[PDB]
Design a protein around this ligand. Structure first.
Ligand code: ADP
Length: 381
């Protein structure tokens, strides 16, 4: 026997899967052709679309396109963290005897779903993707939950795998995976103090990790659970909403769809802003048939979020305090999280540790997956 054993990075927002076949951990590409998937589950009149095609339909299907599934998993309905977010989603999360589900309308009927199977649904597609490129049925996986996950959330995110059909070997911490990606545990026989800076698409996770000879210990976590990628897009989306409104003197705001088209355009823009210094927002017949055609500077950009971009440096210290370690004591700075591609966030942190070089060679949206797959081979039999 042998069996392809994949490591999956289930995200909050996006999830990436990857395997390591003889020598390299290759990161299973996507049907549309991406190294990701946005963690989106949609129910319409005909079908239930997971992955990308779901995310694309969220304007034209608001009330019945479920997402941010990972924020519910683990908690009971009467929890605080659910009560706050309950006021921020186009769908409905209800209670069923203390436990929550998402109520939506699937193929004309009205059904309800338990977080672990909304999150399972993603795994299922994530499952298929592994099968697509490898050419065989994939049963073994290793999943990533953040450091702040308690048994409740683990036993659920473990359960998303079981229900997906997956036989989950072990279930590990994101920050840890990252450190393993870089082989920071493959060490040189001293003690190790490592730092993880995930800056997701919705979550800012910071961790300071001690490797005491081959083994990790999870030291101190920290961050803003509502600061992230989308927020950055919101500042852009909020800006152009203004520039256009003032260019024509016609406000778009309360137009659910006009809003989204710009949205996805600001996203596209922001990403290239990490290499190029100029973005180009090009949306045809946006609103009242008017076209929108403009640009945004990388300069202009960094100043839009500047208040937020800058502020992240704060938890770095804050963990480092609880961690009972000085800036210097860290032997590794690992840039995990997609958003860490923004060069403004990069230098801010690189300056913060005073010139130190940053561990950023692997694509900050994959990284947590890379190890997930690696830690798998070891566990693979
Ligand atoms: N080249 C890029 N430049 C800037 N931001 C990016 C780039 N690529 C992706 N992002 C952003 O990073 C976020 C994705 O991080 P994500 O993959 O969700 O982390 P996790 O998987 O830990 O949730 C998205 O909001 C996306 O817009």
């Amino acid at each position: 026997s042998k069996g392809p054993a994949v490591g999956i990075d289930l995200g909050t927002t996006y999830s990436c899967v990857g395997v390591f076949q003889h020598g390299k951990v290759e990161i299973i590409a996507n049907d549309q052709g991406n190294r990701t998937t946005p963690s989106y589950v949609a129910f319409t009149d005909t079908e239930r679309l997971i992955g990308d095609a779901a995310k694309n339909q969220v304007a034209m299907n608001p009330t019945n396109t479920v997402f941010d599934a990972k924020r519910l998993i683990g908690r009971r309905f009467d929890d605080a963290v659910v009560q706050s977010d309950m006021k921020h989603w186009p769908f409905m999360v209800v209670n069923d005897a203390g436990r929550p589900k998402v109520q939506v309308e699937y193929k004309g009927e009205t059904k309800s779903f338990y977080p672990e199977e909304v999150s399972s649904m993603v795994l299922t597609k994530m499952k298929e993707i592994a099968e697509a490129y490898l050419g065989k049925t994939v049963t073994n996986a290793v999943v990533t939950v953040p450091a702040y996950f308690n048994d409740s959330q683990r036993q659920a995110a473990k359960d998303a795998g079981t229900i997906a059909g997956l036989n989950v070997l072990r279930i590990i911490n994101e920050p840890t995976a990252a450190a393993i990606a870089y082989g920071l545990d493959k060490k040189v026989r001293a003690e190790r103090n490592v730092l993880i800076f995930d800056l997701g698409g919705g979550t800012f996770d910071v961790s300071i990790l001690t490797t005491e000879d081959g083994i990790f210990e999870v030291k101190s976590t920290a961050g803003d659970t509502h600061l992230g990628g989308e927020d950055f897009d919101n500042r852009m989306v909020n800006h152009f909403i203004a520039e256009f409104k003032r260019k024509h003197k016609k406000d778009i705001s309360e137009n659910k769809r006009a809003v989204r088209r710009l949205r996805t355009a600001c996203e596209r823009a922001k990403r290239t802003l990490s290499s190029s210094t100029q973005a180009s927002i090009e949306i045809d017949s946006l609103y009242e048939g008017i076209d929108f055609y403009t640009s945004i500077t990388r300069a202009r950009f960094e100043e839009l979020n500047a208040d937020l971009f800058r502020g992240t440096l704060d938890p770095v210290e804050k963990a480092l305090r609880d961690a009972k370690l000085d800036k210097s004591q860290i032997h590794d700075i690992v840039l995990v999280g997609g958003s860490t591609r923004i060069p403004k966030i990069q230098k801010l942190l690189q300056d913060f540790f005073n010139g130190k070089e940053l561990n950023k060679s692997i694509n900050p949206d994959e990284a947590v997956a890379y190890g997930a797959a690696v830690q798998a081979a070891i566990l693979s039999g």
